[PDB]
């Protein structure tokens, strides 16, 4: 079967992270959309204009709004993109055939939206040469970050080629986790986000979303299906592109 | 010898085009700067804010201004980047050890700044699915363009891999040639631009800067040295990355 996949990058990244996976999925016959979220990739906004994870998600919500009735998509979110998935599913659940989590945060419905971010920060407290700043938007102080190049090399792009790490140095931008805004946000809903099918894809060789964190997330909120990819690194769409496409094909053949 | 190379992308592109060449040059021991010009790559401006090729060049001029006395660089410009080189050389000639033209426009000092652009448009009049628009800045009507995806595939990225063409689809932005603004600009100076050493690198298999154009430019304004790279495509920094690095090493060993 063919599907329409919507690929969702993590904070400080853009659609460009999907530059290897997108053509491979198209070579299987799928439709693929790879979005830039707000203040990401070549989006014209700067992060200081963005006040919440929901606002950050606007391009995804706008895209889903534009789908004609009856058309469903498979969302694929890497790393922090699982939060964009949850936000989207609480507006457009009927348009989502499934969500695939790709070394991603896996929010739940029982705890506040910041819960898995809070846990991540406990498991991985030291972001190396990442720099931080603060800005104010809608009366709240937001912590911005710019991912450190040592962190990128060693922990995110561990096994990627030098020309892929170079792209990350060139293209990663200032972003935010909006952790304190998530902490005050209404909970993700059971009828919306809780109802979607959730497929959790990961590698234990991930050097930022460590196994203790990922296995904790799987226990916390049981996925419908788990795929473990052997080897690779956090950026499986770069280091295990073929394996990710094969998994996504099977998801397209299972959920519609 | 080692050099400091400053890599300058073409219109509608960004530093990302250099993502393969930059690490290769660094693996030879060089320092490399790959800039985003105004309204390009992840630069925050939009093209409608930019009124001339000189304004478009601001990040290059600002970078050169920031070099301490005594430090010289080798400029490397692809495609329309030769115009940025000429602009820069008329402000900061003393900081330029040499300029390398990479399937690039080669402005002169005898004709108006638009001369080689006017010629390009005669040799290559049909930009396929490229779209055009107009905006006004500083009292002039500027023609903007967005490079067509068929033009990108067939003429710019002919022999590049699908994951490189994908990056171009994701990352190319609206831009301009500023052709009519160039046509009214004061001429490039003989003391400044005319004095710099100029190395012309090209392939005859280029599908947009066709051989008739490139050979016309070489005859029009004799380079100090010409290197012809066999095979490849317009994006030699993607299809002939190794060969470009070897040429640049020889330039570093010749001009300081």
Residue among A23, A165, A170 minimizing CB distance to B16: A170
Angstrom distance (rounded) from CA A97 to CA A102:
16
Elucidation method: X-ray
Closest among A30, A52, A203 to A141, alpha carbons compared: A52
Angstrom distance (rounded) from CA B19 to CA B176:
23
Q: Does A109 appear as a known binding residue?
A: no
Closest among A179, A156, A184, A221 to A17, alpha carbons compared: A156
Angstrom distance (rounded) from CA B34 to CA B57:
13
Residues of A in contact with B14 (CB under 8 A): 170
Q: Which helix (H) or strand (E) holds B226?
A: strand B225-228
What is the resolution in angstroms? 1.0
Q: Which helix (H) or strand (E) holds B183?
A: helix B179-184
Angstrom distance (rounded) from CA B188 to CA B107:
8
- For residue A27, give how far its alpha carbon lies from the nearest alpha carbon of chain B (Å): 10
- The stretches of B103-161 forming alpha helices (DSSP H) are 115-123, 149-151
- For residue A172, the number of C-alpha atoms closer than 13 Å in the C-beta half-sphere is 23
Inter-chain residue contact B170 with A14, CB threshold 8 Å: yes
Domain that holds residue B130: 1-256
In the set B52, B57, B79, B114, the catalytic residue is B79
* Beta-strand relationship, B198-202 and B225-228: parallel
Inter-chain residue contact B19 with A46, CB threshold 8 Å: no
Q: Does B10 appear as a known binding residue?
A: yes
Backbone φ, ψ for residue B16 (5° rounding)? -50, -30
Angstrom distance (rounded) from CA B210 to CA B220:
15
Strand partners, A77: A8, A101
Q: What is the CA radius of gyration of chain A?
A: 17
Please, are residues B211 and B236 in contact by the beta-carbon 8 Å criterion?
no
DSSP state of B163: H
Report the first-to-last Cα separation within chain A, whole angstroms: 9
Residues of B in contact with A20 (CB under 8 A): 163, 166
Report the first-to-last Cα separation within chain B, whole angstroms: 9
Closest among B142, B144, B124 to B133, alpha carbons compared: B144
Angstrom distance (rounded) from CA A130 to CA A147:
5
Closest among B228, B221, B244 to B86, alpha carbons compared: B221
Burial status of residue B69 (CB atoms within 10 A of its CB: 0-12, 13-18, 19 or more): exposed
The total of structural domains in chain A comes to 1
Q: Does A57 appear as a known binding residue?
A: no
Measured in whole angstroms, the distance separating CA B95 from the mean position of its chain's CA atoms is 18
Specify whether A9 is catalytic.
no
Angstrom distance (rounded) from CA A42 to CA B109:
36
Supply B230's token pair. Answer: 């066999």
3-state helix, strand, coil in chain B (%, to 5): 40, 20, 40
Residues of A in contact with B173 (CB under 8 A): 42
Strand order in the sheet with A198-202: A31-35, A4-8, A73-78, A96-102, A198-202, A225-228
Angstrom distance (rounded) from CA A162 to CA A166:
6
Sign of the dihedral through C-alpha A169, A174, A180, A185: negative
Inter-chain residue contact A41 with B170, CB threshold 8 Å: yes
Specify whether B234 is catalytic.
yes
- For residue A33, the number of C-alpha atoms closer than 13 Å in the C-beta half-sphere is 18
Angstrom distance (rounded) from CA A130 to CA A136:
20
Cα–Cα separations (whole angstroms), residue A98 to A56, A121, A215, A225, A256: 21, 27, 21, 11, 7
SS3 for chain A is CCCEEEEECCCCCCHHHHCCHHHHHHHCCCEEEEECCCCCCCCCCCHHHCCCHHHHCHHHHHHHHCCCCCCCEEEEEECCHHHHHHHHHHHHHHHEEEEEEECCCCCCCCCCCCHHHHHHHHHCCCCCCCEEEEEEECCEEEEEEECCHHHHHHHHCCCCCHHHHHHHHHHCCCEECCHHHHHHCCCCCCCCHHHCCEEEEECCCCCCCCHHHHHHHHHHCCCCEEEECCCCCCCHHHHCHHHHHHHHHHHHHHCC
Sign of the dihedral through C-alpha B48, B54, B60, B65: negative
Q: What is the CATH number of the domain that holds A228?
A: 3.40.50.1820
- For residue A189, give how far its alpha carbon lies from the nearest alpha carbon of chain B (Å): 33
Please, are residues A59 and A43 in contact by the beta-carbon 8 Å criterion?
yes
Nearest CA in chain A to B20: A163
DSSP codes joined into one string, B70-81:
T--EEEEEETTH
Angstrom distance (rounded) from CA B23 to CA B28:
9
Supply A147's token pair. Answer: 């991912």
């Amino acid at each position: 079967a063919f599907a329409h996949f919507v690929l969702i990058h993590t904070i400080c990244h853009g659609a460009w992270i999907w530059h290897k996976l997108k053509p491979l999925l198209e070579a299987l016959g799928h439709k693929v959309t790879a979005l830039d979220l707000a203040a990401s990739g070549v989006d014209p906004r700067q992060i200081e204009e963005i006040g919440s994870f929901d606002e950050y998600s606007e391009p995804l919500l706008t895209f889903l709004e534009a789908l004609p009735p009856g058309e469903k998509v498979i969302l694929v979110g890497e790393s922090c993109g699982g939060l964009n998935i949850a936000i989207a599913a609480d507006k457009y659940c009927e348009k989502i055939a499934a969500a695939v989590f790709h070394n991603s945060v896996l929010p739940d419905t029982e705890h506040c939206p910041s819960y898995v971010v809070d846990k991540l920060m406990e498991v991985f407290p030291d972001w190396k040469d990442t720099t931080y700043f603060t800005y104010t938007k809608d009366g709240k102080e937001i912590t911005g970050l710019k991912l450190g190049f040592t962190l990128l090399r060693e922990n995110l792009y561990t096994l990627c080629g030098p020309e892929e790490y170079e792209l990350a140095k060139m293209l990663t931008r200032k972003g935010s986790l909006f952790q304190n805004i998530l902490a005050k946000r209404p909970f993700f809903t059971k009828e919306g986000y809780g109802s979607i099918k959730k497929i959790y894809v990961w590698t234990d060789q991930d050097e930022i979303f460590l196994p203790e964190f990922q296995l904790w997330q799987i226990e916390n909120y049981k996925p419908d299906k788990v795929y473990k990819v052997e080897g690779g690194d956090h950026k499986l769409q770069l280091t295990k592109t073929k394996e990710i496409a094969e998994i996504l094909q099977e998801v397209a053949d299972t959920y519609n």
